[PDB]
Write a protein that binds this ligand. Structure first.
Ligand code: 5K0
Ligand code: 5K0
Lengths: 10, 234, 236, 10
């Protein structure tokens, strides 16, 4: 999912 | 955790620095708008606000300390609440109006309107209370952590409760420095927290409304908004 | 001027304690409900009788009488499910993993599993219940919270100052109870915060419950009473 | 007219 991805990016 | 070691003033400074920007909409006065077109503007605006909110949440003390799945859950639960309290905060100095964006000031016009009146009342409440920016960023951070707090452990809830207690102390600290008596502090604290109940209500009502226009196939909902909305589908 | 604001803390507490509705019983047939029909049937009948007590309870809440009849209606329409649920959660405190809708009607999450969308709300109610339990919520605190819900939930829709001041009075009453219990100033405002944050979850559970009730109304499964229909349609 | 209107008077 998108939310889990954006939260994961760094 | 760095959050639990922060002073009240550092907690405020951290939250202030983490503040997302105020985004613009695509509103154009020369362009005609239907009920569908207006929702399109709000949808597009909220979608771009979400990306900023996610990165804001990462800078909220204690939030990163949680597992990814718990970070996801809290955002899924609180996203519309956080958008709305931002909207209400921006609309304080504009009685009878909602400042969705600096180029988009809407009043009681476009039918939906019930939620508008609720948002307007909340803004009226913020204005009468003379809500401060430091209090606002504390309230918004409380919403993020609280709205979805209620396996194995999942002693994360304890951590969240600890941070929540920290933000409580910060609020009281702010009110104390503002020169309020002990009675005024407790009263204002209670006043501020009861608003979160109305914010929760407006979010739930809004989520139902957003679900309606989804099935109506009227407004192009973004991929992320479809995810956030589906999380509340029961 | 209102009598509510002239009351002392103990007077406020005593007034709220005296206004408390009774804990009602369900139908005395055993059969632990599992079907949606038997489940919602018992809950509808129970809530219906509870609503009559709630109405007369609200009249005995200081400050509530001073409001116009229409404002009283609005606040009751807005908060009724919140009030029922915080009662349910309070009753269920010392029965972990269970919901005490009535002394002769204890449900667990296993009975919510047989109704769509119910087990989610059940889990939320259970979590709120254990939360109250871990905080050692006192009856005197509970009645303050229930009055707060009544006066606050629909207070945003020149006498608005009245409810605002009454709400402040109840805040003072809460603090008074915590100071009476021997809590420190820091413990007091921390406990006050914790209690009031739970009101956001109670609100959330009410709105989710309202959706659930609206669904079963559309199902035409359980006969709703005219009173319940009017309380429900108020949210429509 | 509402039932709630009636019950609040009694
Ligand atoms: C009538 C209600 C509907 C919901 C709502 C929205 C909203 C509208 C459409 C969406 O797809 C997502 C969100 C909102 C709130 C705050 C903000 O900064 C931007 C948009 C505000 C007003
Ligand atoms: C998922 C459940 C949880 C609680 C619930 C209730 C309810 C809540 C508290 C009570 O003491 C008694 C009943 C209900 C059920 C049917 C009805 O017609 C009115 C209220 C709503 C649905």
């Amino acid at each position: 999912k998108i939310l889990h991805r954006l939260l994961q990016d760094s | 955790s760095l959050a639990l070691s922060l002073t009240a003033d550092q907690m405020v400074s951290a939250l202030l620095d983490a503040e997302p920007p105020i985004l613009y909409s695509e509103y154009d006065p020369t362009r005609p708008f239907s009920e569908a077109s207006m929702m399109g503007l709000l949808t597009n605006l909220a979608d771009r606000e979400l990306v900023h909110m996610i990165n804001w949440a990462k800078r909220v003390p204690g939030f990163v300390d949680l597992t990814l799945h718990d970070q996801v859950h809290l955002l899924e639960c609180a996203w519309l609440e956080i958008l709305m309290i931002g909207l209400v905060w921006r609309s304080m100095e504009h009685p009878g109006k909602l400042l969705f964006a600096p180029n988009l000031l809407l009043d009681r016009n476009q039918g939906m309107v019930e939620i508008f009146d609720m948002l307007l009342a909340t803004s009226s409440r913020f204005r009468m209370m003379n809500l401060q920016g430091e209090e606002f960023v504390c309230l918004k951070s409380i919403i993020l952590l609280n709205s979805g707090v209620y396996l194995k452990s999942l002693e994360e809830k304890d951590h969240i409760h600890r941070v929540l207690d920290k933000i409580t102390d910060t609020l009281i600290h702010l009110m104390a420095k503002a020169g309020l008596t002990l009675q005024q502090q407790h009263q204002r604290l209670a006043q501020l927290l009861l608003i979160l109940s109305h914010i929760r209500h407006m979010s739930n009502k809004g989520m139902e409304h957003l679900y309606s226009m989804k099935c109506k196939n009227v407004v192009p909902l973004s991929d992320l908004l479809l995810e956030m909305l589906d999380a509340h589908r029961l």
